[PDB]
Each structure stands twice: as structure tokens, then as C-alpha cells.
């Protein structure tokens, strides 16, 4: 069946940290460049033992 709810994971940083915006922009760039996708395919599917 489907999913009960739709949500997501994320990188967490303390409020008022200097790292927050750089990390966020990094996640965005990685997202558009397809790095995240390629990474998931690497860890989840590509070596997948079923079929």
C-alpha cells in the first residue's frame, strides 16, 4: 500500500548557528545536481540483492 503521511529527513543545526545557511544551500545544490539521487541509488538499489 501507500504511505500514511508525507514528510522528509534533514540536516539539523542549532538556532543562530553560522553553519545553517551554508548547509542548506549545500543541500539545495546537491539536490539539483542529482547528487542526492545518485547517492540513494548507490546505497539502496544499485547493489540490491533482490532480483
Amino acid at each position: 500500500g501507500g504511505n500514511l503521511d508525507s514528510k522528509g529527513y534533514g540536516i539539523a543545526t542549532p538556532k543562530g548557528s553560522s553553519l545553517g545557511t551554508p548547509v542548506n544551500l549545500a543541500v539545495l545544490k546537491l539536490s539539483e545536481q542529482g547528487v542526492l539521487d545518485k547517492l540513494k541509488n548507490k546505497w539502496w538499489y544499485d547493489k540490491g540483492e533482490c532480483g
Partner: protein, 51 residues
């Protein structure tokens, strides 16, 4: 989250689900992965053709 609030860690990278309660105390980056609550069971045997 606790280690982040009390300053025992500068950043958190892990399958940390984004929730309102956590978003109140900490800062979440834009989500790097999408998921949802789903149901897992044991795959059944082939139902056989039948008549």
C-alpha cells in the same frame, strides 16, 4: 536534538525526521530525502493459478 540544544554537537547528520516540535527548538535544512510512514509484511506464496 538534545546534543544540539545543549551545545554538545555543532551539527546533526542522520535520518532525522522533520517535526514541528524539533523545528521549534532547532533549525532544519531543506529536506535531503523524502519518506513516509508505510506498512511492511511478509511476502506471501504464489496464489497458484486455480481453476
Amino acid at each position: 536534538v538534545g546534543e544540539l540544544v545543549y551545545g554538545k554537537a555543532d551539527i546533526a547528520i542522520a535520518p532525522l525526521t522533520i517535526t514541528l516540535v524539533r523545528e521549534e527548538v532547532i533549525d532544519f535544512s531543506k529536506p535531503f530525502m523524502s519518506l513516509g510512514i508505510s506498512i511492511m509484511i511478509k511476502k506471501p506464496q504464489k496464489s497458484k493459478p486455480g481453476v
